[PDB]
Amino acid sequence: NNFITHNLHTVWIGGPLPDITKSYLKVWRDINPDYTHITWIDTDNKFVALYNNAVKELREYTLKQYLVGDSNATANDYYDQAVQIERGVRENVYLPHGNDIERIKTIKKIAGSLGDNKVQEYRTKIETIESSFVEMIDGQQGHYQHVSALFEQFSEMDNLRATALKQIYEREINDRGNLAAASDILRLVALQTQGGVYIDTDLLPHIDWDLIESTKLFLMNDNNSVERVYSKEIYLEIEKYKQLTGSKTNKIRSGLTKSQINEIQRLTEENNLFKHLNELEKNCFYSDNSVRGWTNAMLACNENNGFMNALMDRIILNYTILDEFIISNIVTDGEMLNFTEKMSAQFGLNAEHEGSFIPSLANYYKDSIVPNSPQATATLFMTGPTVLDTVIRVEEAVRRGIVKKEAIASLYTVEETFSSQFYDKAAFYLDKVKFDISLNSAEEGILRDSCFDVIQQSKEQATHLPDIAIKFLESLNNFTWKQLELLIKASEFSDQYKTLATLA
């Protein structure tokens, strides 16, 4: 053969697959049936997702009691306690989470320590997870395969890389509980072991834009692409018409006309809208940089890919640097600059090309706890798309022709787009609302201004504000005419704002 093996790899780990994740995968099989569909699952790590939630619930409860005891405390004082709490609950030797058996005993221990009816609440969640995993394993029409066998299969090819990649995988599952970072590893292992195409579960196949042109209903774009204008709205109506199980489309709408919607609806019913995956050249690594930067959301390569090995080694080196960063106990911006040069001399890493990689390491245990710009989170630089982009640059891959751009999946889907909003000081007040902590005239004013700033950002589309933000806005009584006029525009796209629109 001269093309990459017809395998469509997918990764869902830590807990059972949500209704919409399964719904999205169905579409991919219906569009590409001549492909072997594989969804990598961890049967040995079924209660990671739930353990993570058990720790967060305790973290949030301890933070509420901290703010009660110590008022006037700043956001920096708050988030420093938040990281410290998460570290304590995970690093505590008498609360083990190494395996599913250990996790259950630790989960139950936190349930009793939490609330009055939190023991049964968590017992109920446990049984739901067990039941869903049983449905996956024994149930036919399941295209699932285990991670345990994948690593075993990769240890057979490259035990050196397999062993290092397993350590990093297991580290993100336990030490951090970052399921996405662990997925950033699995997606590479699958592609290097079996070969084929990896896609994020939050993506859907590309649609024929030549068919969208032929309708002549989508033309209003002079200094932009039809995709960057209409694609988000189109993938919303496709999903809404398809009425996918557990879809968010039931409570949201698009700014498309009756004429435009009616066209999408008939094309979806004709099922000639989605495009099948293109045949890709065997000895080549594929990705997409259509939306800014290269993404690890969609990848494609045949087994034992040269570039994949280069990318793997770099991720391995990143954790080698991290282990050295942790023990070095970097506090000041002073020690940071010394370390940057120390690693540039030790691992021959030329600075400024990735001048933001080493500073991002301070955010490793802060990630998913402390609100920070995704452009500054450690995960991106560690296993994410930033490390991929760096390898592409260093290896001169685009020029060498070993890495080529290919549009694999659309990132304009409802899932990818619908799933930080508030940051330092602003998100701190939002957490105060959650813990039933009263905000002063000034604090209430900063958050309201921030809530509306977020609604203005997504100019003419649905904004998914947290339930506690909506509860906060609903608790307020007098809004400016413009503020009220904006909440009206928001209600046309999202049903969360229908109560706030009732006000007029």
Q: What are phi and psi of 172, to 5 degrees?
A: -70, -30
Resolution (A): 3.4
Paired tokens of 437: 């902590």
Longest dimension (CA), the chain: 69
- The experimental method, as deposited, was X-ray
- Residue 427: CA atoms inside 13 Å, Cβ hemisphere, count? 16
SS3 440: coil
Pairing between β-strand 295-301 and β-strand 285-288 as defined by DSSP bridges: antiparallel
32 close to 40: Cβ distance less than 8 angstroms: no
Q: Distance (Å, rounded) from C-alpha 325 to C-alpha 320?
A: 9
SS3 7: strand
Q: Distance (Å, rounded) from C-alpha 248 to C-alpha 236?
A: 9
Q: Distance (Å, rounded) from C-alpha 113 to C-alpha 203?
A: 39
Query: What string of DSSP letters covers 65-91?
Result: HHHHHS-S--HHHHHHHHHHHHHHHHH
Closest to 59 in 3D by CA, of 39, 82, 79: 82
Closest to 137 in 3D by CA, of 46, 43, 25: 43
Paired tokens of 217: 């209903």
List the beta strands (DSSP E) in 168-284: 196-199, 204-205
Closest to 311 in 3D by CA, of 192, 150, 172: 192
When computed from its CA atoms, the radius of gyration of the chain, rounded to whole angstroms, is 24
For 203, residues 6+ apart whose C-beta sits below 8 A from its C-beta are: 24, 297, 298, 408, 409, 410, 411, 413, 415, 416
CA distances in angstroms from 467 to 202, 250, 497, listed in the order given = 22, 17, 11
User: How many other β-carbons are positioned within 10 Å of the β-carbon of residue 162?
Assistant: 22
Q: Distance (Å, rounded) from C-alpha 368 to C-alpha 173?
A: 14
Provide the sign of the torsion angle of the four alpha carbons 235, 239, 245, 251, taken in this order: positive
